[PDB]
């Protein structure tokens, strides 16, 4: 296996996480490595 990614408070204000990651109960598959996890807004 398991792993964590950790982000600072002021960075999270600037980022848009994909819903599958931010709301994990909705996920039904793996997320692909190297694919989008969060984008700058």
């Amino acid at each position: 296996x398991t792993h964590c990614l950790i982000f600072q408070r002021d960075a999270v204000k600037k980022l848009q996480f994909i819903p599958k990651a931010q709301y994990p109960e909705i996920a039904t598959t793996n997320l692909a490595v190297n694919s989008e996890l969060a984008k700058l807004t």
Binding site: X1, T2, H3, L5, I6, N30, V33, L40
Partner: protein
């Protein structure tokens, strides 16, 4: 040089408390079905520490068995984990929980699982010819249609660009086919196999997924330290990052207060390497010794979500604070970086996939690029 299983035997027998616990953690497993059998349902449950040690020693020269070939419908959560299968129910007992939190026990398990890892990366399978390591994988069922289809399907589920065959997805040695299990020389090379070029393209976004993985939790506004043992397992940065034992990481703990923690799970049939989630300069890197088979009380017998048939699966938040793990902290406030401050990556072992392998490109002071392969889990301690 002593057999690490024999060192473990002596630890147990030469300490009155561990001797007690090594009996009680089996006595506390119910006799009645389904606990008369291990969680796979395929074998009787082990009921004493001497049989446990015998099996652990035997496993030092065995690759994990793909038992779903001949038994497609049994519980599959412990595919890859022969040690976990033996101790899964004892892990869920009050005495087993105490046993698998003992630091001397875990040093012995580390040495046992690291001796196992030596075998798993041995292309001779301990002196059985130059192709022994490959043959052991074929004998263990991994070239079956069932196993290869499972590996192909799992890789395909995360992308719209789906591939028909294993060889279009993963890199393997030359002249590899299903019949020769893609000529993988040993378990470890199969386990840490890389994706083929272009199969996992690096997205434009500032943050990409570091692991081929299944979302578990997303927590905002996390605390410096917290009661990670209470129901719901609130994250405790101080414990997770190892500030208990390394003052050097304490400033980073402070800088993550109020931040967010995202956690995701890597299945046994998933890609197991680690890719850089962001571009930036490594400012801190560590490895932290810890547990292997420690799970929550809630995941045990009588627990609100136990006994876990594949512990520590339902205890994944808890073990970030105590399991064998690693820490990487990357400064993105650099040229070519996204300027989103410090980003932490904390790979955390589970059971006998607990070898946290940082590649040399992650040395403190080096810069990594988003999408670079930066390490991997291995079967081992």
């Amino acid at each position: 040089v002593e057999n690490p299983v024999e060192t473990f035997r002596k630890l147990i027998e030469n300490d009155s408390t561990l001797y007690m616990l090594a009996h009680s953690m089996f006595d506390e497993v119910p006799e009645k079905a389904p606990y008369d059998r291990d969680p796979t349902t395929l074998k009787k449950q082990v009921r004493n520490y001497k049989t446990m040690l015998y099996l652990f020693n035997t496993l030092l020269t065995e690759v994990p068995e793909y038992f779903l070939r001949d038994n497609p419908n049994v519980p599959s959560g412990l595919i890859g984990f022969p040690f976990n299968i033996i101790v899964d129910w004892p892990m869920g007992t009050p005495s087993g929980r105490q046993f698998f939190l003992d630091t001397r026990v875990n040093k012995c398990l580390k040495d046992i699982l690291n001796k196992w890892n030596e075998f798993l990366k041995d292309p001779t399978a301990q002196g059985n010819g130059n192709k022994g390591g490959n043959q052991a994988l074929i004998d263990a069922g991994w070239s079956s249609d069932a196993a290869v289809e499972q590996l192909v399907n799992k890789a395909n589920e995360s992308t719209t660009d789906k591939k028909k065959t294993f060889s279009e997805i993963f890199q393997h040695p030359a002249n590899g086919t299903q019949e020769n299990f893609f000529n993988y020389a040993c378990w470890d090379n199969f386990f840490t196999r890389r994706f083929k070029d272009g199969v996992r393209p690096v997205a434009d976004a500032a943050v990409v997924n570091a692991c081929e993985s299944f979302p578990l939790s997303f927590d905002t506004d996390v605390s410096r330290r917290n009661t990670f043992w209470l129901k719901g397992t609130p994250y405790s940065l101080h414990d997770m990052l190892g500030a208990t034992q390394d003052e050097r990481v304490a400033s980073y703990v402070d800088g993550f207060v109020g931040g967010s923690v995202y956690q995701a799970f890597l299945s046994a049939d998933s890609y197991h390497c680690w890719n850089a989630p962001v571009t930036g300069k490594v400012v801190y890197r560590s490895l932290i010794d810890g547990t292997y088979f420690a799970e929550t009380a809630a995941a045990g017998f009588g627990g609100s979500n136990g006994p876990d048939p594949a512990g520590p699966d339902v205890s994944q938040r808890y073990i970030t604070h105590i399991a064998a793990r690693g820490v990487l902290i990357v400064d993105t406030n650099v040229t070519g970086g996204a300027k989103i401050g410090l980003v932490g990556f904390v790979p955390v072992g589970m059971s006998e996939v607990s070898t946290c392998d940082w590649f040399d490109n992650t040395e403190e002071g080096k810069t990594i690029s988003k999408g670079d392969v930066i390490g991997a889990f291995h079967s081992g301690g």
